[PDB]
Amino acid sequence: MERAEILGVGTELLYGETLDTNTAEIARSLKPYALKVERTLRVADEVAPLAREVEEAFARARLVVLSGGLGPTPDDVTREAVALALGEPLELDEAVLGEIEAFFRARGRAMPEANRKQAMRIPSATWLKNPRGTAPGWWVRKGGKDLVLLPGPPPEWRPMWQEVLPRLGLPRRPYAERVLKTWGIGESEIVERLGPLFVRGEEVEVGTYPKVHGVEVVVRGREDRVAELAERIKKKLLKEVWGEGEMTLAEAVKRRMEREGATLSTMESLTGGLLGAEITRVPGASRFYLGGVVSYSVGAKARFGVPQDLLSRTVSAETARAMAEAARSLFGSTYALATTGVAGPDPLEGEPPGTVYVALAGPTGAEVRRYRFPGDRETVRLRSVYAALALLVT
Amino acid sequence: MERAEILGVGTELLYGETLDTNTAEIARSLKPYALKVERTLRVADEVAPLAREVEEAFARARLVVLSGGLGPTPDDVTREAVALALGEPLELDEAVLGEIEAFFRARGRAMPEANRKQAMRIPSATWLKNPRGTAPGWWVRKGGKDLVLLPGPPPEWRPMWQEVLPRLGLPRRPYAERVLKTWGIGESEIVERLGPLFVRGEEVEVGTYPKVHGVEVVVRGREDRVAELAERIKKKLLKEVWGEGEMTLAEAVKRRMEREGATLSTMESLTGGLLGAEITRVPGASRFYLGGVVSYSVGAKARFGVPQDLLSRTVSAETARAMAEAARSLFGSTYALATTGVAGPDPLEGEPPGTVYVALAGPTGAEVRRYRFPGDRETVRLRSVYAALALLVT
Ligand SMILES: Nc1ncnc2c1ncn2[C@@H]1O[C@H](COP(=O)(O)OP(=O)(O)OC[C@H]2O[C@@H](O)[C@H](O)[C@@H]2O)[C@@H](O)[C@H]1O
Ligand SMILES: Nc1ncnc2c1ncn2[C@@H]1O[C@H](COP(=O)(O)OP(=O)(O)OC[C@H]2O[C@@H](O)[C@H](O)[C@@H]2O)[C@@H](O)[C@H]1O
Ligand SMILES: [Mg+2]
Ligand SMILES: [Mg+2]
């Protein structure tokens, strides 16, 4: 098995000022291909060391993938280092320069001189278009080997990588991963519910991964084994599984609302807006989500329809019900969600951080669910958002 | 300046099954010393590739540090790789083996035979005690160079490292770093404004880090050189610096509101609640943040005060101003922020994705800023949140 080598470029990655997730994500994407990943590197933004590491990775590898340092600044040296490592001159491509200039023109700016180096390439490179930023990537095919340069930000490189990857002509191997997403059941109860299905052979293996949106059950390995094992696991957890793969609670809610021709609105306290944020993260949200209130003060709560009598007891089922009913009446939506409780770090009304009520008001009345969540302030806010969503799709 | 090499060992680190914080944490611990970290590696649990990387690392470095693979399983091969890489045989230390047998006896168990190999070390190694786990570390002094082996778990290695590090006799250099957080200036303008200040020497260097919350400018290296160069730099960027170090936009906004005794509300369209969520992320936000509305439907935009005549150009500076003025009136807050625009993927009102207006209303009036953000839907939404917060801290 030939090697894939994967280098994250950036001094800030060495120190973990940002944690390098790119090399790992790229390693994971390579699992359906018959390439060995023996190591990954993070490399400082310095031309001579980077060139040395690139030259060495390329010598030993079928595929070398770099991310980062394609920007316009003196700390962005990946293109100069790669051209040094491959023994090729960097050449300005006028057409790409024109494209960057147009990108700045559209935004009402003249292109600064520093951007020019983003349009440089070596003879062996073809361009990988980047509609999400100013630095296009490179794909170098040379001597039967591939070297791919990607911009550092994941929102920019992910769809570039996704497109180039099948074009590389890499040898395949039958791998698959199936992600089964559950809610309201702990790791232990899942293991025990599965029993012999909880396989950990080298052909195929099952794992449990607790997340803020519930425990994932992940099946990975040889594609045939994954498909069959995942089917059987899915049956054992049929009541707990709310979606798979790319499905999210926010998208499942969207599917339900569009199936019913229904609308949704929200009123939030401790989640601060994060619930409306999560609903609207999914394209098409405006077809059903009418909007929401962030009632983060007594005055706002009263103004938008929560009864005076409840205002001094916010950590309660009665409050979560009244807020969902207030939202529904204010927006006239088919359904409304509410969140109230203690995020942390301080207790509130004698209740510890993590004490949360979420409520759903619909045509047939209201329901409330109480949780006691583990985690710091941000984690409790997150789990509260997924718990309110779960009211509609679990 | 000589090199320090840092290798995290473990196949799971390559794929992100375990997130490699060890290598970065060790690199940060080395900042007080005159050593260059050019790269960090993560390496698979295989004895041949691991020994090759250790050999290469040791050859080029004054210091090598490894973590992980000190366990008792067949996949724990770090001791074997180091011995191989350094051309020395492993030797059983009978006293350490008795300590391991004590560890298992201390918990009512015989020592499994697999744990025997944890008492092996090479002649050039002294032991590093581990009172938290069974694997002692190594300190190898050889050829005026140091190589340290540490166990994978942070609670085990952290005290071990802190104890051995000041014994290694590493050359010290007075280190400092300064992080300047900017908004509303791109990397190229920064390059041009700074010009020759954008130093990249061995004693001191300047870097930029483009984030969704704006460009961070980092100066790091010799203590006297960093203070002067960062002061000059901050003076060149005075209008655009809104914070330093650990400061965040949400915290900066909190500071201003507490300084003035002022309150804040929001009205959001495209950001969907994300702006409220970012404001309330910081503990103590309830002292100034009254709440907000998410006016996602045209009906909600009209309900919360956007004038009828603007509902056909909700993506405009006039509407953003009207939304901020409405929120301010609706909540009776000192200030209000509003967001409106085109998140993507589809255009809206003829305007392309990334077209965003943010506005601030206060006692002295309202103001609006327009942006054209490249990026996918989630990125446009995030940038808009920070753009709105930047109106209050410039
Ligand atoms: N290994 C990594 N893992 C996770 N995130 C990363 C990594 N490397 C970079 N990032 C993220 O990307 C950010 C920018 O990293 P750079 O290396 O500077 O990316 P660069 O390739 O130079 O491009 C920067 C910007 O310039 C534009 O022309 C280009 O389109 C991009 O918008 C980092 O601050 C970090 O948030
Ligand atoms: N680079 C890393 N970054 C962060 N955490 C890490 C890293 N490497 C390991 N860890 C953490 O430590 C855990 C164990 O990693 P191993 O490499 O297996 O640790 P190892 O040195 O082999 O020792 C494991 C156990 O065996 C004992 O004898 C030894 O004392 C330790 O208790 C990992 O699951 C992870 O939680
Ligand atoms: Mg860059
Ligand atoms: Mg181990």
Numbering used by the authors:
A (entry chain B), B (entry chain A): 1 to 394
From the study:
Here we describe the determination of the crystal structure of CinA from T. thermophilus (TtCinA), which contains both the NMN deamidase and COG1058 domains and is therefore a bifunctional enzyme. In addition, we show that TtCinA adopts a three-domain structure, with a third, previously unidentified, KH-type domain between the NMN deamidase and COG1058 domains. We demonstrate that TtCinA adopts an asymmetric dimer and present structures with NCN, ADP-ribose, AMP, and ATP bound, which provide experimental validation for the modes of substrate binding proposed previously. We use these structures to propose models for both enzymatic activities and suggest that large scale movement of the COG1058 domains is linked to ADPR catalysis as well as providing a rationale for the usual asymmetric arrangement of the TtCinA dimer.
Data were collected from three different complexes, following soaking of TtCinA crystals with ADP-ribose, ATP, and AMP/ribose 5-phosphate. Both the ADP-ribose and ATP data sets produced clear difference density in both catalytic sites (top and central panels). Examination of the recognition of ADP-ribose in the open binding site (chain A) showed a hydrogen bond from Asp-20 to the adenine ring. A strong peak in the electron density map, inferred to be from Mg2+, was identified between the α and β phosphates. Such a location would be consistent with pyrophosphatase activity. Asp-76 binds the Mg2+ ion and is absolutely conserved in CinA sequence alignments. Glu-156 appears to play an important part in recognition of the terminal ribose ring; it forms two hydrogen bonds to the 2′- and 3′-hydroxyl groups in the ribose ring and is also absolutely conserved in sequence alignments. Recognition of ADP-ribose in the closed site is very similar to that in the open but with the important exception that there are additional points of contact between the ligand and TtCinA from residues in the KH domain of chain A. The side chain of Lys-211 and the carbonyl oxygen of Pro-210 form hydrogen bonds to the 2′- and 3′-hydroxyl groups in the ribose moiety in the ADP part of the molecule. In addition, the binding of the Mg2+ ion appears to be stabilized by Glu-187, which extends from the end of an α-helix in the KH domain into the ADP-ribose binding site. Conversely, the closed site is more likely to correspond to the catalytically competent state; critically, the close approach of the KH domain from chain A, with Glu-187, would promote the binding of Mg2+ and hence polarize the P=O bond for hydrolysis. A major feature of the TtCinA structure is the asymmetry in the dimer, which is caused by contact between a KH-type domain on the opposite chain and the bound ADP-ribose.
